[PDB]
Design an enzyme around this catalytic site. Structure first.
Site, PDB file in Angstrom:
ATOM      1  N   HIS A  46     -49.742  65.376  46.279  1.00  0.00           N
ATOM      2  CA  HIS A  46     -50.675  66.189  47.060  1.00  0.00           C
ATOM      3  C   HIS A  46     -51.980  66.498  46.327  1.00  0.00           C
ATOM      4  O   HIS A  46     -53.049  66.473  46.945  1.00  0.00           O
ATOM      5  CB  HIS A  46     -49.990  67.467  47.512  1.00  0.00           C
ATOM      6  CG  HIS A  46     -49.060  67.236  48.650  1.00  0.00           C
ATOM      7  ND1 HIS A  46     -49.492  66.733  49.858  1.00  0.00           N
ATOM      8  CD2 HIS A  46     -47.719  67.374  48.754  1.00  0.00           C
ATOM      9  CE1 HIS A  46     -48.454  66.592  50.666  1.00  0.00           C
ATOM     10  NE2 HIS A  46     -47.370  66.983  50.025  1.00  0.00           N
ATOM     11  N   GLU A  68     -53.175  66.958  34.922  1.00  0.00           N
ATOM     12  CA  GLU A  68     -51.744  66.675  35.072  1.00  0.00           C
ATOM     13  C   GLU A  68     -51.035  66.670  33.721  1.00  0.00           C
ATOM     14  O   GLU A  68     -51.434  65.936  32.813  1.00  0.00           O
ATOM     15  CB  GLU A  68     -51.518  65.329  35.758  1.00  0.00           C
ATOM     16  CG  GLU A  68     -50.084  64.817  35.619  1.00  0.00           C
ATOM     17  CD  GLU A  68     -49.057  65.744  36.272  1.00  0.00           C
ATOM     18  OE1 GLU A  68     -49.306  66.208  37.412  1.00  0.00           O
ATOM     19  OE2 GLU A  68     -48.000  66.004  35.645  1.00  0.00           O
ATOM     20  N   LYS A 106     -40.473  50.262  55.363  1.00  0.00           N
ATOM     21  CA  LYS A 106     -39.631  51.115  56.190  1.00  0.00           C
ATOM     22  C   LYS A 106     -39.902  50.779  57.653  1.00  0.00           C
ATOM     23  O   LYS A 106     -41.059  50.803  58.101  1.00  0.00           O
ATOM     24  CB  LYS A 106     -39.899  52.593  55.900  1.00  0.00           C
ATOM     25  CG  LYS A 106     -39.228  53.573  56.846  1.00  0.00           C
ATOM     26  CD  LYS A 106     -39.604  55.001  56.433  1.00  0.00           C
ATOM     27  CE  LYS A 106     -39.106  56.037  57.446  1.00  0.00           C
ATOM     28  NZ  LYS A 106     -39.406  57.412  56.944  1.00  0.00           N
ATOM     29  N   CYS A 611     -42.419  35.500  52.315  1.00  0.00           N
ATOM     30  CA  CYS A 611     -41.960  36.794  51.824  1.00  0.00           C
ATOM     31  C   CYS A 611     -42.988  37.394  50.867  1.00  0.00           C
ATOM     32  O   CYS A 611     -43.403  36.743  49.902  1.00  0.00           O
ATOM     33  CB  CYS A 611     -40.609  36.622  51.124  1.00  0.00           C
ATOM     34  SG  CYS A 611     -39.921  38.119  50.344  1.00  0.00           S
TER      35      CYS A 611
HETATM   36  C1  LIG Z   1     -33.889  66.192  47.272  1.00  0.00           C
HETATM   37  C2  LIG Z   1     -35.279  66.077  47.876  1.00  0.00           C
HETATM   38  C3  LIG Z   1     -35.600  64.974  48.646  1.00  0.00           C
HETATM   39  C4  LIG Z   1     -36.860  64.838  49.221  1.00  0.00           C
HETATM   40  N1  LIG Z   1     -37.146  63.754  49.986  1.00  0.00           N
HETATM   41  C5  LIG Z   1     -38.363  63.612  50.559  1.00  0.00           C
HETATM   42  C6  LIG Z   1     -38.719  62.444  51.391  1.00  0.00           C
HETATM   43  O1  LIG Z   1     -37.886  61.536  51.588  1.00  0.00           O
HETATM   44  N2  LIG Z   1     -39.950  62.372  51.922  1.00  0.00           N
HETATM   45  C7  LIG Z   1     -40.871  63.339  51.718  1.00  0.00           C
HETATM   46  O2  LIG Z   1     -41.999  63.233  52.263  1.00  0.00           O
HETATM   47  N3  LIG Z   1     -40.623  64.428  50.952  1.00  0.00           N
HETATM   48  C8  LIG Z   1     -39.431  64.614  50.354  1.00  0.00           C
HETATM   49  N4  LIG Z   1     -39.167  65.739  49.571  1.00  0.00           N
HETATM   50  C9  LIG Z   1     -40.215  66.727  49.323  1.00  0.00           C
HETATM   51  C10 LIG Z   1     -41.172  66.123  48.249  1.00  0.00           C
HETATM   52  O3  LIG Z   1     -40.512  65.748  47.031  1.00  0.00           O
HETATM   53  C11 LIG Z   1     -42.318  67.087  47.887  1.00  0.00           C
HETATM   54  O4  LIG Z   1     -42.847  67.595  49.111  1.00  0.00           O
HETATM   55  C12 LIG Z   1     -43.501  66.466  47.130  1.00  0.00           C
HETATM   56  O5  LIG Z   1     -43.108  65.750  45.943  1.00  0.00           O
HETATM   57  C13 LIG Z   1     -44.516  67.557  46.760  1.00  0.00           C
HETATM   58  O6  LIG Z   1     -45.541  66.982  45.952  1.00  0.00           O
HETATM   59  P1  LIG Z   1     -46.654  67.919  45.276  1.00  0.00           P
HETATM   60  O7  LIG Z   1     -47.803  67.026  44.846  1.00  0.00           O
HETATM   61  O8  LIG Z   1     -46.890  69.160  46.118  1.00  0.00           O
HETATM   62  O9  LIG Z   1     -45.882  68.468  43.967  1.00  0.00           O
HETATM   63  P2  LIG Z   1     -45.164  67.582  42.808  1.00  0.00           P
HETATM   64  O10 LIG Z   1     -45.023  66.141  43.235  1.00  0.00           O
HETATM   65  O11 LIG Z   1     -43.984  68.409  42.401  1.00  0.00           O
HETATM   66  O12 LIG Z   1     -46.286  67.608  41.662  1.00  0.00           O
HETATM   67  C14 LIG Z   1     -46.627  68.822  41.002  1.00  0.00           C
HETATM   68  C15 LIG Z   1     -47.305  68.383  39.717  1.00  0.00           C
HETATM   69  O13 LIG Z   1     -47.802  69.523  39.032  1.00  0.00           O
HETATM   70  C16 LIG Z   1     -47.699  69.209  37.646  1.00  0.00           C
HETATM   71  N5  LIG Z   1     -47.857  70.458  36.895  1.00  0.00           N
HETATM   72  C17 LIG Z   1     -47.027  71.531  36.898  1.00  0.00           C
HETATM   73  N6  LIG Z   1     -47.524  72.520  36.093  1.00  0.00           N
HETATM   74  C18 LIG Z   1     -48.707  72.060  35.596  1.00  0.00           C
HETATM   75  C19 LIG Z   1     -49.752  72.574  34.688  1.00  0.00           C
HETATM   76  N7  LIG Z   1     -49.642  73.813  34.134  1.00  0.00           N
HETATM   77  N8  LIG Z   1     -50.809  71.772  34.427  1.00  0.00           N
HETATM   78  C20 LIG Z   1     -50.931  70.536  34.957  1.00  0.00           C
HETATM   79  N9  LIG Z   1     -50.016  69.997  35.783  1.00  0.00           N
HETATM   80  C21 LIG Z   1     -48.908  70.703  36.124  1.00  0.00           C
HETATM   81  C22 LIG Z   1     -46.361  68.509  37.488  1.00  0.00           C
HETATM   82  O14 LIG Z   1     -46.364  67.738  36.281  1.00  0.00           O
HETATM   83  C23 LIG Z   1     -46.336  67.670  38.763  1.00  0.00           C
HETATM   84  O15 LIG Z   1     -46.794  66.315  38.592  1.00  0.00           O
HETATM   85  C24 LIG Z   1     -37.884  65.884  48.985  1.00  0.00           C
HETATM   86  C25 LIG Z   1     -37.577  66.995  48.203  1.00  0.00           C
HETATM   87  C26 LIG Z   1     -36.300  67.124  47.644  1.00  0.00           C
HETATM   88  C27 LIG Z   1     -35.944  68.309  46.796  1.00  0.00           C
HETATM   89 CL   LIG Z   2     -37.946  60.079  57.455  1.00  0.00          CL
HETATM   90 ZN   LIG Z   3     -38.054  37.143  49.313  1.00  0.00          ZN
END
Ligand SMILES: Cc1cc2nc3c(=O)[nH]c(=O)nc-3n(C[C@H](O)[C@H](O)[C@H](O)COP(=O)(O)OP(=O)(O)OC[C@H]3O[C@@H](n4cnc5c(N)ncnc54)[C@H](O)[C@@H]3O)c2cc1C
Ligand SMILES: [Cl-]
Ligand SMILES: [Zn+2]
Ligand SMILES: CC1(C)c2[nH]c3ccccc3c2C[C@@]23CN4CCC[C@]4(C[C@@H]12)C(=O)N3
Ligand SMILES: CC1(C)c2[nH]c3ccccc3c2C[C@@]23CN4CCC[C@]4(C[C@@H]12)C(=O)N3
EC number: 1.14.-.-
Length: 664
Positions: A46, A68, A106, A611
């Protein structure tokens, strides 16, 4: 385009660490700037979607730095994405031919509902995606998607710094013209932290909520929550011994039962590849995307691995997301030595169909490094009560989260990231153009809708999640009520009209259909009835009858009111055009096929004869989509015509909503 090895050779010539070779691709250099307009904490998906959309929405207006703490794009769970995400990638200049080199195809979503009291009995609900000449959906390895978006950001004037951590104890965030002083270090041990003077801080730190937790305690919804535990497995070429009839590995498959469900996602993994080599591969793919190289003339995934010195394998992501009022045996040591492993293997042997299913798969050890054979995460769902304030806003998981089911995390969550991105331009300009008190007041009023949308978003997704979970307790309610309503209310209508300018506005009207009134009426009737039956009991047959009849009565009126033309019977395998359930119906469009050589799933379209994954030439006939019911040559031409390029921005068009037509 001849492939270049710029980063591989730079890393070797300078003995550069992972963070250093990544940061050397920044437009303003490998060291932090002294000042920026926006500082984004976190380069998860995000934080990067935010930065890409902000720059693309209005180029050369905001200086943006993303901080990051990981030294290179890190492991994340969250792999399944939806048409809205693909469309966003395509609007940012990367279409399916290039994305399928990196990610898994997918097709649709499939659900199998296991009877708990009649072991071996199951029903299903089956959907398809889209023709290859329409769009694709993607299964993404998150270290690769975050690398893709990092490189693309750096190529579009955004600086991304890996190996750097925002220090939230010494950071100062306030409502001024340039009020923020973001302290960035390499870690708690670092004696020489740097400061970025800046106007706007974006909390994209995910579930860690590193900034907005300072402004309000985390909020939990009433009732049970969920836990998840998961691992990574081989990906069989031959899927024919899977115990579910008509199973296909290029769906996001859901195995559902009273206690929760299991996700099954087939995707390619690049683990073991050096980061500099990967930068060269991603860079080459973007250069090919810029040049418009046709898919057949583009190297396959395996050929890219040879060219750039990479590791490439097919894996299956498999995990449980189950209620946290499940009762476990005191002693689970027979099922393994760690809790995640223990609860995973214990649940598998509770259902003969899960055990027969899992017996097609071999466990992969430590795919993402030591200690990563098994993952567990407890108490999934939460909300942040405050998501903006003087000098800052939060996006993505830092706003709240519910459940993996239907993938709202990435695909719905990007409504916040992209709306925040659009709003960042006036936020920063207000601050540069007005005295401090009026600027802060005007920014606050600008963000009232953003705050109110976030406030209402997570509770609506949480009710959607409970709706599906309670219906998964019965093999008729699951497919004929919950799945049916989620697809009728939540298929995003008129996505073909979206462009960069309207994307955020469209995205916030979607919410997987969880705001549709008739959806909420059925959801509340089911939740109210089923939550009175203890989890360890079977639902009474009369309750299922009553709920089914109530859902169908509400469905007929809402379907008659929808003015949107869609071949529902070709997309939903079990339903006719008017969304009535048809007991034995099996017919559906066929958009995909499995490579006989490597097992990878492919899109059918005439201009892709080979492919994309291994390069094996398929025969000319197999390239033809099957439309059932048939489409004429003209109808097929008309459908494909609507999906070539997005419309230019017209500031007088009314935005067509993704949700069904109101009854009036
Ligand atoms: C079991 C499970 C399955 C899921 N399956 C799906 C799915 O199939 N499809 C889907 O769309 N969503 C899925 N989700 C939800 C999805 O994983 C999250 O919505 C998504 O990864 C959120 O991304 P983000 O960028 O908000 O945060 P994150 O990807 O968590 O990134 C946050 C970042 O902040 C960084 N950070 C933290 N503190 C600091 C700091 N002080 N300084 C600098 N950097 C820092 C971390 O290193 C990290 O890279 C799932 C969630 C779970 C728990
Ligand atoms: Cl899905
Ligand atoms: Zn192939
Ligand atoms: C609307 C669409 C983007 C979509 N959005 C979804 C959200 C969740 C689950 C499934 C979908 C689908 C499947 C659709 C249905 N449309 C029929 C004509 C063209 C199109 C586009 C595509 C198609 O081929 N497949
Ligand atoms: C509907 C509107 C009030 C609106 N509601 C939003 C909610 C979230 C994000 C953005 C918006 C906008 C911006 C809009 C989009 N419309 C395009 C044609 C007329 C109009 C009205 C206006 C316009 O010019 N700007």
């Amino acid at each position: 385009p001849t492939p270049k090895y710029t980063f591989t050779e730079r890393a070797a010539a300078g003995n550069l660490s992972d963070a250093e070779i990544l940061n050397s691709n920044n437009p303003t250099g490998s060291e932090l700037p002294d000042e920026s307009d926006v500082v984004v904490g976190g380069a998860g998906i995000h934080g990067l979607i935010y930065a890409l959309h902000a720059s693309k929405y209005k180029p050369n207006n905001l200086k943006i730095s993303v901080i990051e703490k990981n030294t290179r794009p890190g492991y994340k769970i969250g792999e399944s994405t939806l048409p809205i995400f693909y469309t966003w990638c395509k609007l940012h200049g990367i279409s399916a031919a290039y994305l399928l080199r990196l990610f898994g195809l997918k097709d649709g979503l499939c659900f199998y509902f296991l009877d708990r009291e009649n072991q071996g009995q199951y029903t299903d609900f089956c959907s398809v995606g889209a023709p290859g000449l329409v769009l694709a959906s993607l299964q993404i390895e998150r270290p690769m998607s975050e690398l893709l978006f990092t490189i693309l950001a750096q190529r579009n004037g955004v600086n991304v710094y890996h190996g750097r951590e925002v220090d939230f104890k010494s950071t100062v965030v306030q409502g001024g013209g340039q009020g923020n002083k973001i302290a960035v270090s390499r870690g708690k041990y670092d004696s020489t932290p740097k400061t970025i003077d800046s106007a706007l801080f974006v909390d994209a730190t995910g579930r860690f909520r590193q900034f907005c937790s300072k402004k309000a305690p985390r909020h939990r919804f009433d009732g049970w929550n969920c836990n998840a535990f998961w691992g990574y497995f081989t990906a069989p070429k031959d899927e024919s011994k899977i115990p579910f009839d008509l199973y296909e590995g290029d769906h996001t498959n859901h195995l559902c039962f009273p206690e929760g469900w299991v996700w099954v996602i087939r995707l390619p993994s690049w683990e073991g590849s050096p980061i500099a080599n990967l930068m060269d591969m991603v860079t080459y793919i973007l250069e090919c995307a810029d040049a418009g190289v046709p898919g057949d003339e583009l190297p396959s995934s395996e050929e890219l691995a040879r060219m750039f010195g990479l590791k490439f394998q097919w894996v299956t992501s498999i995990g449980f997301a189950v209620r946290n009022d499940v009762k476990y045996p005191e002693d689970l040591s027979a099922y393994g030595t760690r809790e995640a492993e223990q609860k995973f293997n214990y649940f598998v042997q509770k259902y003969e169909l899960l055990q027969q299913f899992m017996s097609n798969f071999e466990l992969i050890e430590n795919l993402y490094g030591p200690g990563t054979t098994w993952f567990i995460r407890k108490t999934l769902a939460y909300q942040s009560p405050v998501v903006s304030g003087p000098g800052w806003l939060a996006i993505g998981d830092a706003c709240g989260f519910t459940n993996p089911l239907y993938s709202p995390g990435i695909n719905v969550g990007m409504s916040t990231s992209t709306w925040a991105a659009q709003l960042s331009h006036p936020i920063v300009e207000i601050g540069k153009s007005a005295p401090a008190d009026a600027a802060e007041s005007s920014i606050r009023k600008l963000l009232v809708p953003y705050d109110d949308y976030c406030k209402s978003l997570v509770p609506a997704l949480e009710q959607m999640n409970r709706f599906n979970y309670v219906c998964y307790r019965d093999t008729r309610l699951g497919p004929q009520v919950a799945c049916l309503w989620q697809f009728f209310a939540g298929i995003d209508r008129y996505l073909s009209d979206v462009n960069i300018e309207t994307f955020a506005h469209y995205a916030i009207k979607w919410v997987w259909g969880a705001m549709v009134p008739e959806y909420q009426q059925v959801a509340q009737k089911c939740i109210e009835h089923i939550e009175t039956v203890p989890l360890d009991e079977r639902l009474p047959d009369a309750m299922v009858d009553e709920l089914l009849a109530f859902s169908n009565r509400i469905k007929s009126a809402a379907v008659a009111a929808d003015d949107f033309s869609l071949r529902w019977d070709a997309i939903l395998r079990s339903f006719d055009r008017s969304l009535n359930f048809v007991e034995g119906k099996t017919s559906r469009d066929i958009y995909t096929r499995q490579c006989s050589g490597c097992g990878a799933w492919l899109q059918l379209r005439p201009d892709w004869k080979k492919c994309h994954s291994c390069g094996l030439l398929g025969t000319e006939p197999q390239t033809a989509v099957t439309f059932d019911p048939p489409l004429t040559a003209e109808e097929e031409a008309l459908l494909y015509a609507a999906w070539n390029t997005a419309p230019k921005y017209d500031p007088s068009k009314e935005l067509k909503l993704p949700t069904p037509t109101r009854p009036a």
